[PDB]
Design an enzyme around this catalytic site. Sequence first.
Site, PDB file in Angstrom:
ATOM      1  CG  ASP B  54      -1.810   1.221   1.283  1.00  0.00           C
ATOM      2  OD1 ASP B  54      -2.731   1.337   0.448  1.00  0.00           O
ATOM      3  OD2 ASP B  54      -1.583   2.071   2.170  1.00  0.00           O
ATOM      4  CB  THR B  87      -2.266   7.206  -2.296  1.00  0.00           C
ATOM      5  OG1 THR B  87      -3.431   7.481  -1.508  1.00  0.00           O
ATOM      6  CG2 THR B  87      -1.098   8.031  -1.771  1.00  0.00           C
ATOM      7  CB  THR B  88       0.365   4.142  -5.682  1.00  0.00           C
ATOM      8  OG1 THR B  88       0.346   3.625  -4.345  1.00  0.00           O
ATOM      9  CG2 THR B  88       1.691   3.784  -6.339  1.00  0.00           C
ATOM     10  CG  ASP B 393      -8.799   0.188  -0.309  1.00  0.00           C
ATOM     11  OD1 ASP B 393      -8.780   1.067   0.578  1.00  0.00           O
ATOM     12  OD2 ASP B 393      -7.771  -0.400  -0.706  1.00  0.00           O
TER      13      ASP B 393
END
Lengths: 71, 528, 519
Positions: B54, B87-88, B393
């Site tokens: 994550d 986010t990534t 999520d």
Amino acid sequence: LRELDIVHPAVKVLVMATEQQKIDMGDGTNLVMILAGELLNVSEKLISMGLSAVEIIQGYNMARKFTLKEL
Amino acid sequence: KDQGNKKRQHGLEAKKSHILAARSVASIIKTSLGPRGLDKILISPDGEITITNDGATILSQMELDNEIAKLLVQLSKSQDDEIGDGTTGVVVLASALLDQALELIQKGIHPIKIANGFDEAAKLAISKLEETCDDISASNDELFRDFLLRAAKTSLGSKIVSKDHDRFAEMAVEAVINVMDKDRKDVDFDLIKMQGRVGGSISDSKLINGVILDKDFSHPQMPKCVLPKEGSDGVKLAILTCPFEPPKPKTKHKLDISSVEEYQKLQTYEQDKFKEMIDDVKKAGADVVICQWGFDDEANHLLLQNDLPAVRWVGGQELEHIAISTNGRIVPRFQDLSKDKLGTCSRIYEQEFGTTKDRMLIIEQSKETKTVTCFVRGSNKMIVDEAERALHDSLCVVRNLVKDSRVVYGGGAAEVTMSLAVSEEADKQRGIDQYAFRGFAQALDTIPMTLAENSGLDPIGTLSTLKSKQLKEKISNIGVDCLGYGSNDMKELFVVDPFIGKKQQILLATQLCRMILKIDNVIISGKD
Amino acid sequence: IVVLKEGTDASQGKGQIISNINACVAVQEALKPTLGPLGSDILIVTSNQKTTISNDGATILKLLDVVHPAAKTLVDISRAQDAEVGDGTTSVTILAGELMKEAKPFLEEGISSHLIMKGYRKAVSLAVEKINELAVDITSEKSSGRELLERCARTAMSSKLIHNNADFFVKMCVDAVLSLDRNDLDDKLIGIKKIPGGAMEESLFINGVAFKKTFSYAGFEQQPKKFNNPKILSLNVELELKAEKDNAEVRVEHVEDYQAIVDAEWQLIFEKLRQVEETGANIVLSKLPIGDLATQFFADRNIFCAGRVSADDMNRVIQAVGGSIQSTTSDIKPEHLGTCALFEEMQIGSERYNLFQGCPQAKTCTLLLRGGAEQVIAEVERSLHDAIMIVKRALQNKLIVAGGGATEMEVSKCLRDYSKTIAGKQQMIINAFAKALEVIPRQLCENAGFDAIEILNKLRLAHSKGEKWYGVVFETENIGDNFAKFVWEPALVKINALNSATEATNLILSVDETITNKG
């Protein structure tokens, strides 16, 4: 002078002179310092000619008396 | 102030240093992008070793002295709530935009023009996404529910829970339905409590229609369950905040007994107060006493004699959850307690999960409620953490899907389409806008290349094939082999990402790029 | 046995002045990107690891606090400017840095700092005179303290729904700010009410405060609808046959006793209502509903009442009429009664609307809008809010000078022209000051991404002829008349900024040596 870091004992003479000027008189703090510095500077020229400190002091005293009378 | 040990950069190395720092930060989680992204080992200062891919978790636990990196990490921390699973991708897109801005500056383009061009390119890409988006809810309700469940299953399958992830997806969907209404189409996560503990198995997940309140009932002899009393009107709850004890001094106390007179007076006062409180409780008709504070020995004895199970130290948010679930009200004091303010619930019983012997207390409604709790269990702490993250999520994805009927497809197909549109539009706009659009398209190209690299595919050939397929033949949803798939064209593989999610990703990436670029001078003092 | 300098000495003379100039240059370079609305931000990390990103010059200076004595003096002058004025801090710092830069070559050539300071003072005097001349305060040129505000309101409402009808709304917007204390302007003191029906050009300007109907009990339209000597008094909790506040539940098992108690309460209310008249309150207002008994008594006594008044509307009405709010009728005092020239209910919109007019001493006003639909009135309200904000900003500083570097360009041109008539050593200092004044437009163009050299050259060429309001356009890279575009800055702020910058330059350049004592 009250704030400057002065360690050389000779400068303390002029510091005390400025203190006396401030205590007794209400002005002339810079004048005394300037006059003393100039007198000591011209003393270098006097010494360069080979004059002894004693006669230099005597002449300075005589000139001081004459100047005070003339003022 | 604190001039010594002060460093600064401005005029020569500021832009290069900032861009290099951003690239270094991005490279931390670049390899973790996608469902098959490589994991990273995170070790606590106490020596606890954890494994996860994550990006949000990796960046959140990373502290550093670099100002640009600190700003990027702080922005990602706030963005984690807005999207969570993006986010990534946002970090990678921002890093690619900064890399392109490096070349643009090397060509003599002022940073403000680069930022404006990136904003225009983001607007064009969002417009293209809106044009190419498809509606699921407007096609079939059955298909919409199927896609919701598929998204939840896809989110859950990346973790250990993949063996029996269907239950988690069903619980998440039920919680979203119970808590969210279609008037706003927004899930109130504050009303969806996440709770769990180490032990049991992944099949012990349960959705509760109210607060848990795993309390010991204070007195050992206090009953641990509140039964419905064979068909009675459920269980009546006394929602109270005043402690179940008489006023006491805060300085000395030491109310000891020295003679008969003092004993009689103190007993009279204390018994009168306790009797008043217990009589008020009984008149209210409540079956269970819930107080924000603890209970005195005399209060506990009186409640036990009257068959009134007690709940101690219930938090304000817990009281609000009780009121919402039971349609009750919070009574400041015992004297203000009445039957008109008591809440109703189906039962208050102990529930066992797997081999757990704790016998936690749970308040159950069995009906539709505006507040629910997602209970998560597992054979290990890592399992519980992964299950909670996957549930979060899935909830975010379901909220995004319900909020906007327009959706896009993952695997970089949307990124490729946006890149193609931006490249086509670049040649139409003259000036620095052309360079900005080309840079934005190249940055968009980064995401599919990174995904291909993480999947073991060649980014160059994969990206070229995707562009050829999406340009020469037709516009479709063709991505990289993020997971084991028979072929390309995710459209038939049912890999769907919400349109709002992608729009938020693009907007946040653009905002982060602007924030990093707009800083032309950094000053840092020393440390004590 | 105590030494403060630890045996460390320092030089004195032009060397220390050059070092101070270098420190000022460093500060100016640090604060350069923050100049102008398009400037870049600066990230500063404190000793506590707190990270702050901001563009305001004051915050940056406070966070940095450079220990260098020249930088300390610059920061002190900037803080003084911010506290006394609050605008131009960054401009003051930039001007001081530029002046220090210009002073360096003169010192390197052997020019005494006294001559530089005297020339800077003369340049400041000339610049102040030229700014005062350039300052716009005109009456006969179709502009004034009121007409200019109307033009600004029209510009604000440009490309809007009421742009074609701005000729009437500009007057309303200007009067709204001018109808209250002109030395204390606040947007909250200008209210707007939406009344359906009628054309937008029929909107009414109310000197006092107006609000929609709030009374819905017996006696409606049974009380006077116009007052020539009104007395506004806000009574809190009476106006009922039965007490509403601080009451209690009374249970009586006998009909006679209950009837007697109710009759006694009714008699008390009768006495209170009579006292209301005895207090001379012709208009009775309250945030709570008014009973039928009170309304009937007031109607029979030719007294107007209206309850269920919103807190904001009640407060605005009280402030406009100069009255107060009284807890009880028996405590009503004459000093709490407000008066307006005329109070009446407006029937526009098929409904009666209360309004107070002809009260020039009111501290607040209300605007009544008309239109065929609520959406049109909402758009009119938005346009009026924009115009009100713009006119308030304009009126806060009626003495204005062309912005976007136009004032700086004019001052530089005037100083350059004067330098040809100030033959002597002062010419170099005058030219240096004129060149330094041009830093502001240069840095503004650089921060905006424009071609600073080309823009500056074009501005210099253009300013030699035509109007004196030519400046830099920051919407699209070009030059033009900023005044015609309604872009300007206060003259007093610019004068204060120049004075502060020159004061800082003189203070720093007047220091020949700095001595630090250990502590």
